[PDB]
Write a protein that binds this ligand. Structure first.
Ligand SMILES: Nc1ncnc2c1ncn2[C@@H]1O[C@H](CSCC[C@H](N)C(=O)O)[C@@H](O)[C@H]1O
Ligand SMILES: [Zn+2]
Ligand SMILES: [Zn+2]
Ligand SMILES: [Zn+2]
Lengths: 14, 247
């Protein structure tokens, strides 16, 4: 249960 | 404080500038993705003549079959050296600078006006499977890192630019961005690059929408300053590590 991490998710700008 | 991308090519000088606060902290600068665990043809454009090349015509432009499917041409392209569809491979980056922001850390800004749909930089790093991702998640939480650099590439491939990467790792989040990710195929292998979504005036910070999947207990407040800012990187909901890493 980390503190501030996460993953960015590519997507096409809408 | 700001710096130009050639400043990152000299490690000794960079490290000395970093101690004076004139450059971001040192990382391993790499030219393409490095896989921690290695994993398992031509367009139909008619070759430009020598004269058409002299007249300013574009080789493998908007109508190139590879470009339309976001596939880069190889050296065997019928347009040869003139192929304009090898931007990732030829490192044909936009003219950008790395700048220190007020409270997001370092960031990227356009040094010239950037037309819409301009290739900025490839998001390079170490590519991890779910097993290596969980180990990095634990290491970075243990180290109490502030910034995260995980980028989902495909189901079992996460690009990690924390330790190795290029200046693309400095692109900050905005809820009203002017860039986007595009997934491009290079030599049968998938890559992620940043592309402007609009005309970006010189001096403007370059940003994209992280669509952040937060697994951490604490949400980072968003300082993008947009009129429609979501308040936090990752939004309202916290997801599991497995879900953030692509299940
Ligand atoms: N809009 C934003 N508001 C607050 N912090 C941001 C932000 N965009 C990016 N960041 C910070 O930057 C991290 C992404 S890596 C982006 C480069 C970073 N600014 C650096 O100096 O290395 C995030 O984890 C967050 O800590
Ligand atoms: Zn072509
Ligand atoms: Zn081509
Ligand atoms: Zn915001």
């Amino acid at each position: 249960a980390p503190s501030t991490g996460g993953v960015m998710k590519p997507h096409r700008y809408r | 404080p700001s710096c130009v991308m050639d400043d990152f090519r000299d490690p000794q000088r960079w490290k000395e500038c970093a101690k004076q606060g004139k450059m971001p902290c040192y990382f391993d600068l790499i030219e393409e993705n490095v896989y921690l665990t290695e994993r398992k043809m031509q367009c139909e454009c008619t070759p430009l003549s020598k004269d058409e090349r002299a007249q300013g015509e574009i080789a493998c432009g908007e109508d190139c079959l590879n470009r339309l499917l976001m596939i880069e041409c190889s050296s065997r392209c019928p347009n040869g050296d003139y192929c304009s569809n090898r931007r990732f491979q030829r490192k044909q980056h936009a003219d950008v600078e790395v700048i220190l922001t007020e409270k997001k850390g370092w960031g990227l800004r356009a040094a010239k006006d950037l037309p819409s749909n301009t290739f900025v930089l490839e998001y390079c790093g170490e590519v991890l499977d779910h097993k290596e991702f969980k180990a990095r998640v634990k290491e970075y939480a243990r180290n109490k890192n502030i910034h995260y650099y995980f980028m989902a590439l495909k189901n079992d491939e996460i690009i990690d630019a924390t330790q190795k990467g290029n200046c693309s790792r400095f692109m900050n989040h905005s809820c009203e961005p002017n860039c986007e990710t595009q997934k491009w195929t290079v030599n049968g292998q998938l890559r992620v690059g940043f592309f402007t979504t609009k005309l970006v005036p010189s001096g403007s910070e370059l940003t994209f929408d992280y669509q952040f999947q937060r697994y951490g207990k604490e949400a980072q407040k968003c300082f993008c300053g947009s009129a429609n800012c979501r308040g936090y990187l990752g939004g309202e909901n916290r997801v599991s590590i497995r879900a953030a890493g692509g299940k």
